[PDB]
Amino acid sequence: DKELIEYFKSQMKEDPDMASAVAAIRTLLEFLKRTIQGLRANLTSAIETLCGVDSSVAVSSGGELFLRFISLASKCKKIMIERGELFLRRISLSRNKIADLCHTFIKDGATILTHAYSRVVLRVLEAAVAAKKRFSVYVTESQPDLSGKKMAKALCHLNVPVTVVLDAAVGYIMEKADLVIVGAEGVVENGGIINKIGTNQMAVCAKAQNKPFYVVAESFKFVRLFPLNQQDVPDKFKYKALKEEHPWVDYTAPSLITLLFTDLGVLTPSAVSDELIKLY
Amino acid sequence: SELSERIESFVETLKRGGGPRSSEEMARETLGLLRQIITDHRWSNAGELMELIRREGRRMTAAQPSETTVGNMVRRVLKIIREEYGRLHYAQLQSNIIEAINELLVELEGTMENIAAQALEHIHSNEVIMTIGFSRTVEAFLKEAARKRKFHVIVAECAPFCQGHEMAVNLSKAGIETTVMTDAAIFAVMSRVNKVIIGTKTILANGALRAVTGTHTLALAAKHHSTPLIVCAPMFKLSPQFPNEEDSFHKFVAPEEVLPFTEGDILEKVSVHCPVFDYVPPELITLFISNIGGNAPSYIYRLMSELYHPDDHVL
Amino acid sequence: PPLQAVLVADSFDRRFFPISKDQPRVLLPLANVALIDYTLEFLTATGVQETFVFCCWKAAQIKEHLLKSKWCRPTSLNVVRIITSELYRSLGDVLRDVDAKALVRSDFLLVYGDVISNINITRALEEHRLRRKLEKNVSVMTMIFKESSPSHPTRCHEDNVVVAVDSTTNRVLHFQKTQGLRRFAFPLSLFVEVRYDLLDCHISICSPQVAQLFTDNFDYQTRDDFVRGLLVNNQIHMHVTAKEYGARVSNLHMYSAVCADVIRRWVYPLTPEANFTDSTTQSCTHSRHNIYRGPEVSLGHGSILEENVLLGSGTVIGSNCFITNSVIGPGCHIGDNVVLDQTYLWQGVRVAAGAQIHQSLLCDNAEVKERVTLKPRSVLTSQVVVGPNITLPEGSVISLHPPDAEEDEDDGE
Amino acid sequence: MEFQAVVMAIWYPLNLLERVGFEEVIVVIVCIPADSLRYIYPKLKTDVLVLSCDLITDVALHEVVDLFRAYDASLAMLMRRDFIGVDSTGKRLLFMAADLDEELVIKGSILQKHPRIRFHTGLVDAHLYCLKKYIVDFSELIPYLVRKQFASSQSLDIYSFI
Amino acid sequence: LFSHLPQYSLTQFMSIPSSVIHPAMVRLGLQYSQGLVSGSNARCIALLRALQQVIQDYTTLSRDLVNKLKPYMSFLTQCRPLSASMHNAIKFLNKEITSVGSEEAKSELRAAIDRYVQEKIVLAAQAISRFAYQKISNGDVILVYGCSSLVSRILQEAWTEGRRFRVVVVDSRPWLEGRHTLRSLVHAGVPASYLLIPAASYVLPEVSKVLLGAHALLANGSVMSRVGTAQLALVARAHNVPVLVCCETYKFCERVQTDAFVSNELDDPDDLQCKVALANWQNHASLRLLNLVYDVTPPELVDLVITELGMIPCSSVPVVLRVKS
Ligand SMILES: O=P(O)(O)OC[C@H]1O[C@](O)(CO)[C@@H](O)[C@@H]1O
User: Fold this and answer.
1) Sheet-wide strand order for C322-324
2) B181: closest CA among B141, B231, B221, B148?
3) Rounded to whole angstroms, how far apart are CA atoms A120 and A263?
4) Among A148, D43, D140, E285, which is most buried by a count of CB atoms within 10 Å?
5) Residues involved in crosslink (Glycyl lysine isopeptide (Lys-Gly) (interchain with G-Cter in ubiquitin)) (chain C)?
């Protein structure tokens, strides 16, 4: 109950490249290793405490799928841990599938524009330079955590011309961008995405100039929310935990998104919804 | 005096009811009153004359702030005074203004024939036009194009005052293949409509427009299907007021037009409003067929500078 | 011929008691405007010259207000000629005083001095004159009823007159006030529609014979007596409007109904922002939800005016207040965190803090202290003070006069 | 068999019924033998059209039948001493009085529900009556039932045609 | 023009004890024609009750019942053109009759109407109410339009489950139908406001979300409903307020339509004149009075569809049309 939080923090510690939701799944499944009737009640408390320490959408989404990817099977605890281990085996290969689908969408000599920092966009570009494509990356230093500089330092090792553009200068450099690639922190039920603050005005500018806005999310980031504006995003997700507002996420409408390169194949935004309807 | 009682007769019939039906008669009565004020009050120079006309137009505008055709023709007389005192810079000035006012009046009474003359340039055979309310200028615009070509006008009657009924009968009497519809079907039959020709209550100073209610919905439907929204409106309907949030824009008539008094007890809990004027931003307007041409909305500001002095914008 | 009118500016039912003790019930403000200034303006909208004004009870206030009003200036095309006498005890004395002075020589409008309406008596007047010359003085009156619905706030369930009308000629054949009644008795001699959806509205267009018919039969006192006493004997007809407002302010209930109807623009040429009386101290701006604020009002911080609010000139409002559906009056002080819902506050009030006024009427110069919780239907007459803890009950009148109240000018009696 | 027309106790009603389309006409394919409908009760309990052979001639009774089918009226009457009071629409019966009373007293609740009551005096009763199957349960019951909407053997609603 | 769509102002020819059409079906058709039954859900309930009456009076089955009650639906298409809720109801009924193999099949059929009305018109309404409770927050103001048996149910149960919102009722001539919403709101105690469609752009500045009802959702996501809905949703998007449409699954028609011209019933034009200057409109040869009953809003003007399955983005209504069939 308390060892769960420190074990989740550990699963952050020995690998930061592993996603937050995947860390939640790993600590959740290791909690499942330790009556099995109504065990959803035990795991729901684990989900609530795990979303307490991490405010991200993916932790309360990917953990929700594991609450029901084990509950689609309905002793049964052994088939539960077997199917859960299969679930973990098939989300360790998400970023590779996304990279394989998405690096073919980057033309040679292109000039992409990305946002804050994401292990998926970084992997898309890592696979694109491994396919002997050459391009340049514009990354916005996203306030307040400055993870644009972290991405550009993590992407300069790939020998890519990367430019840490200002957070305000998206509308300036949007015309110098062939395509926009962002990593979603959660994909809501209408096909839009919930991503680090500033993704929305990246999209709104991009559609103002008809630049394709590509999103590279994963399968476990499919959350059941249906926002209609930036109000409808819950305060659980926006606020991470001289007056200042300071959210950390904002909703991007599905009309602004050209394609999603999720784990389960390339989707139009309209193709997201039944991929949530199927999981129900 | 006869003039003074005629001034508050005009002010009272402006607050309370009607009097002049059309805006052309409203502007003609306004010039009649302003010309009478010039002739019959005693003033020495144009200074206190401008002050007198300014305060009379101030009370005529505060009488009914949504009747801007009165407030424009106060400003045109002020511009006329400033430009007929400028060219003498007295004694004969009192004559000169009157002459210019007469040249303004014959500039009126031919505003409709110079808008109707441009009908054939903008209306073609086998087209289809949509109109919202009864406009005297738009009707005469549709009459002049009717005697040469053959078209089909859809008059979306503007509820609650079903005043597109009185236009679709006027158009049907002249053989235009008219069609009156409920005006809940503006977007529905918009897909088959070639042009929208509407009238205004007021053209604001940015090319924005104050029309009968349901026009902004009509304009949005026209912009959706990219149907050109032609606007037939003369230069007394051109007011040098930008869409402030300070002064009141709308006019709100009794809710009996919308929800009748015979509804009973639910009228103590329900807030019924009934505005009569709708704001149309200039980006939904395509043309302003004036009496001097067919110029774009993004020229309307220049028409302000040739009509009203900048000091006379606020009275 | 020119159209005249008789305006009985003293309602002869002791109905607004004790508010009638210190201000006449024709001069008390409806929505920052005295009631007579509605009906007078009504007559000016109709086309009425020579609007005789009959005042008996406290004619000093009424005359000194009329001579400083809009219709006593020579610019107005509605001359008044105030008739002042203490001889009048009822409307019958008023219409009998019309004779022996011959003030009317054609058909005239008899409004009752507290009518509030935007009725246009030209259709009704032309219909009345059409069947006046035609049948040679068969008709003597043409009552004006509004096509209402029987379950309406404006219908007080104290007037609620039912009529029996001949639908082909609009003649009134029966007429009775259904104040206390469950089943309505209609005699069979009148054999013919029977209508209950008629707001009375008191704008009869009685011909001068009516002034004759009040003098010879001295027993009549009021118009209800006249219509009842001549439908047993010379033919009251009627005209029913549907698109125009009309109602008088007989009691304080229908006061609240008509004041809420005026704010919601049901009397459209007579809205508070129209400033139909040309006073400089009653200008308004109809903002968004029938929220009218006068000049120099200085709304506080965080205070919410939801809807149907009228604020007079000089109406500083505190912080985090909540004012709905009410009239606050021309120049008064409202403090912090108050709630003013369906209230009616006249010229000058001290509402201190945190008060919860919910269906009341606060007259002019009435003060209330901190943390006072006036309940519905409470009336605070002029110059009263209510102390810092008086959660006074519903339906309680407080006045400086001791016997005509349920309290006095101190903290909760 | 929606309507089962009943004839009181002559070629005019039977010819009108055959012109409408009726296959059988009971007279109290014609059955041999105003409480006479109670003696013809062992008929099928369909909707009835109680009719009397006197003072009936070539009326478009179909339209009156429509007032039975439009509104699911408990009663539909044909009219062409007793005063009736109809609604503002001119089809809904509200107050059927003969002149037994000295005063036409009206319940106030009718007037609050229906404010405009048009009173017709001495209309000719067309000897045609339309009833549902429950009004026959065990003029007569024609002014009683119009009071019964203010008995319940299924409020009810009763319409008339003039 | 509107030549293919039919203009109507029909019981004079049929015998009073009718044998061509069933008695219940005659009552139903004439109630449709006069206007006693309005609304897609109310028309579907009344149709299914009349069909239960038809089946319980049927005496002999699979082919016979279908080709016997096809003239009934021809009569109903004559009296008032069938909305797609009625169309899918009739399609389900014909599939049910053809599915019944070789007396006792009449009771099993009649309960399948009850198992149709419950879990697709009533239980679906409860599920849509539960889903739309989430999208209704405290303090917001909701613009509804006309009368819908589902929209008003959603508002009433959202109010009685603790929300404190406000409704603006937008209404259109000549049906003046949102009064039936408005009064039904005031009985529930909901604060309300009423105004016509031309004033919609006046109150869309204050409106938080537009909650409409759908008479049919087509196979591309276009929402076929009452004639003011598409225009209202267009002005709603121009004032950037979200548009929610609340539709059950069974109203999903596989017919597809782009413009508001293909399947749009015309009510009689004589409704249009208001108190008159238009009473003599027949004698004016050039003058034609046109009132549509339905129009389609495109799926880009609708932000959300609420359905008993869930909340779907109006571009995945063919998804639901797939998974229910
Ligand atoms: O690293 P991930 O899992 O791709 O997360 C994607 C998004 O989440 C964030 O890292 C935090 O919001 C964002 O910077 C990024 O766009």
Assistant:
1) C304-305, C322-324, C339-341, C356-357
2) B221
3) 11
4) A148
5) 21, 63, 101, 177
Quote the tokens at residue B259. 């929800």
Q: DSSP string of B59-127?
A: HHHHH-TT-HHHHHHHHHHHHHHHHHHHTT---THHHHHHHHHHHHHTTSSSHHHHHHTTHHHH--TT-
- Between CA C50 and CA C80 the distance in angstroms is 6
Give the C-alpha separation, D90 to D116, whole Å.
Answer: 10
Which residues fall within 8 angstroms of residue B135, CB to CB, at 6 or more apart?
Answer: B167, B198, B199, B232
A200 CB less than 6 Å from ligand 1?
A: no
Q: Which domain holds residue E102?
A: 1-127
- Interchain proximity E16–D22, CB inside 8 Å: yes
To 5 degrees, how large is the angle CA B138–CA B142–CA B147? 155
CATH class of A98-279: alpha beta
Which residue of E183, E198, E278 is in closest CB contact with B266?
E183
Rounded Cα distance between B210 and B111, Å, is 19
How do the domains of chain A map onto residue ranges?
Answer: 2-97, 98-279
User: Quick one: CA dihedral D60, D65, D69, D74, positive or negative?
Assistant: positive
Class of domain A2-97: mainly alpha
Residues of chain C found within 8 Å of residue D98, distances taken between Cβ atoms: none
Cβ–Cβ < 8 Å for D158, D145: yes
Residue pair C211/C104 in contact (Cβ under 8 Å)? The answer is yes
Let me know the angle formed at the C-alpha of B143 by B141 and B148, rounded to the nearest 5 degrees.
105
> Does the Cβ of A238 fall within 6 Å of ligand 1?
no
Between CA C331 and CA C334, with CA C333 as vertex, the angle to 5 degrees is 130
Would you call E312 and A277 a contact, using CB atoms and an 8 Å cutoff?
yes
Among the candidates E66, E95, E127, a domain finishes at E127
Chains D and A share 3 or more Cβ pairs within 8 Å: no
Largest CA distance in chain A: 61
Helix (H, G, I), strand (E, B) or coil at C375: coil
Helix E229-238 and helix B215-224: axis angle, to 10°?
90
Q: How far apart are CA B144 and CA A68, in angstroms?
A: 72
Q: What is the Cα–Cα distance from C148 to C152, expressed in whole angstroms?
A: 8
In terms of residues, how long is chain C?
Answer: 413
Helices (H), C249-400: 252-263
Place of tokens 């009050």: B41
Do residues E257 and E283 lie in contact, with contact meaning Cβ atoms separated by under 8 Å? Answer: no
Answer yes or no: do E46 and E190 share one domain. no
* D3-160 topology per CATH: Spore Coat Polysaccharide Biosynthesis Protein SpsA; Chain A (3.90.550)
